[model samples]
Target: MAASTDIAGLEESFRKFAIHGDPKASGQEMNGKNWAKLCKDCKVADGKSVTGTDVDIVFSKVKGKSARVINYEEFKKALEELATKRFKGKSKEEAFDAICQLVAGKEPANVGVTKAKTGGAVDRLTDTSRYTGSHKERFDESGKGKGIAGRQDILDDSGYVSAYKNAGTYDAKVKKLE
Candidate 1:
């Protein structure tokens, strides 16, 4: 048998989210954002994540007695209806089983399989060959002495300050900025 506990505790979840729109919401019924909140993370009968439109559609379908909202009873019926829709030509027992899993916050057996990556990409593992001794030898002495160290001789201001000290001469030139 399915984990009927999930079905049993379904009402708890219903009442919890049923008042999201209005805390003073009367009775056990849900409408407006309450429905949206309940169906927010829920999956449809078809195992697709419920879209915003799906929430409205299901609310309208489940809304009874001109109430414009679904009571706990109607909510229960809505879950079953979703299950039936997803079942297609399958058995109702399976539908109930699948809905139970959904209520337990588990993914329904998915069919829209994408490419899995249990094995990682070609570049996932580091190229160990690059770390080997022979490979190190391949790059050895390749770019040696191309460094800017030799070209940085201009930075050694060793005696340049002494040279400028004696070279100071009076000039009448004034820096002007218009």
Candidate 2:
């Protein structure tokens, strides 16, 4: 198989899952719901929860009449495109979605930046707070949120503080099925 053929095959499967799924979305789950959610999947690998964005899988078939050679640079470039360029300012969820959508079309898929869809008043609030207690409180002397003290409880404290979670392999040794 030629490299282009191999890539085309991989892309076919990518589009299938990205647009729907093995059993299809049944007109709900992935039926044009937020493009972001449809693309990412939460699955555990390497003993920790990992999403589709965590890694990229690429298959290359370089056959040339008994002179096949895989171009490491091309492989590296593809992986870099996934990790660095694709997921950069995206939230964890969005990042995962982008990974899922790659190659999700007759042609390789292309995604662009767009604002996320949020709910009601929550959407209006560009920022918020969940704090108002203990040593984390503060007084707004400027008469804004006056008479009330606050703590930045909305601060994301549940981040990966201990260590990075199960980051697994970028490439797997499996048969490439287009």
Candidate 3:
């Protein structure tokens, strides 16, 4: 649900739906077939099914001939609009924060704290343990007998955690979330 206004990431997501794994076509555009598939995948990804008519409506807004072809910018805009519409009663900041939580696997408070605080390297483990009141239960086993780690596997990794903390853009965005 994390809304990324970032161009490259959006392009990469769209590319996954591209026909034949080709995002950069020399003489071709995103035809109906590909667009349809993209919508279908988007339904699963967004957890909100967009109507065909809605898809066409956005498609028409883009510079496409007969709802057939659109550039990355148009596609990104359409997706953003769809997401914005999905969170109808919320501010863009709230929607964006939810999106980041869903996609990036950051805890809601962690995201909020970064926005509220001016500067500090807050350890996620310490914060989570403090909130949950059980450091040992942090690695507690799941009912299915698998060890349930942190919220998101990749985000829980030390490397990813460090990188997220060190990311300048991340801090900047968090600051704006306030």
Candidate 4:
């Protein structure tokens, strides 16, 4: 199932993010000024304001031992808007899309219906097309006797693989097509 995009992985990333602490989840501490630029991208905090400092002030009190649950309904809706702009068809993208749709109060209309396009906005959809390219490889045996030697794949030389492989294996290599 293609689903919205990479909602599942996004959700997992969200889950991991949630564990990192609200301050981190807010994504501001790492990039303060830049993050503030996305303020309009707010999803009403569990509290009234979405200020990182406020979230930090409050979340610190609930650090561990407290079970926090996000208002998923709100999260889903936020994700949908994001999906419209970023519905790449990789499993990560698909997974994230699934979560977004699931929480956003809708299901991805194209899951399983359209082939996954690991890279850009266009390519594998009916608007474009799907394909099964190549996957064989040729190793550079020239480095054989060296200590740091292994079968190193020659870039732009080995047989190409599907931009989208299956499930966990999907490389999400979409830029190449674009």
Best by lDDT: 1
TM-score of 2: 0.18
Which stretches of candidate 2 lie above 4 Å from their native place?
Answer: 7-9, 18-35, 42-80, 85-178
Segments in model 4 whose C-alpha atoms lie over 4 Å from true places: 1-8, 22-70, 86-178
TM-score ranking of the models: 1, 3, 4, 2
Q: Model 3, stretches more than 4 Å misplaced?
A: 1-8, 19-29, 44-49, 64-67, 93-178
Q: Per-residue lDDT for 21-64 in model 2, tens only?
A: 23432221122222223234212111233234343222122111
lDDT of each: 0.55, 0.35, 0.49, 0.37
TM-score of each candidate structure, all chains considered together: 0.44, 0.18, 0.40, 0.21
Candidate 1 off by > 4 Å: 1-6, 21-27, 45-50, 104-178
TM-score of decoy 1? 0.44
Residue 52 of model 3, lDDT score: 72
Pull out the clashing pairs in model 1: none
Model 3: clashing residue pairs?
1-99, 2-99, 2-100
Minimal lDDT window, size 10, model 3:
105-114
State the displacement of the C-alpha of residue 152, model 3, in Å, after optimal TM-score superposition.
46
Q: Higher TM-score: candidate 3 or 4?
A: 3
All-Cα superposition RMSD per candidate: 28.8, 23.1, 23.7, 23.0
How many clashing pairs in candidate 2? 2
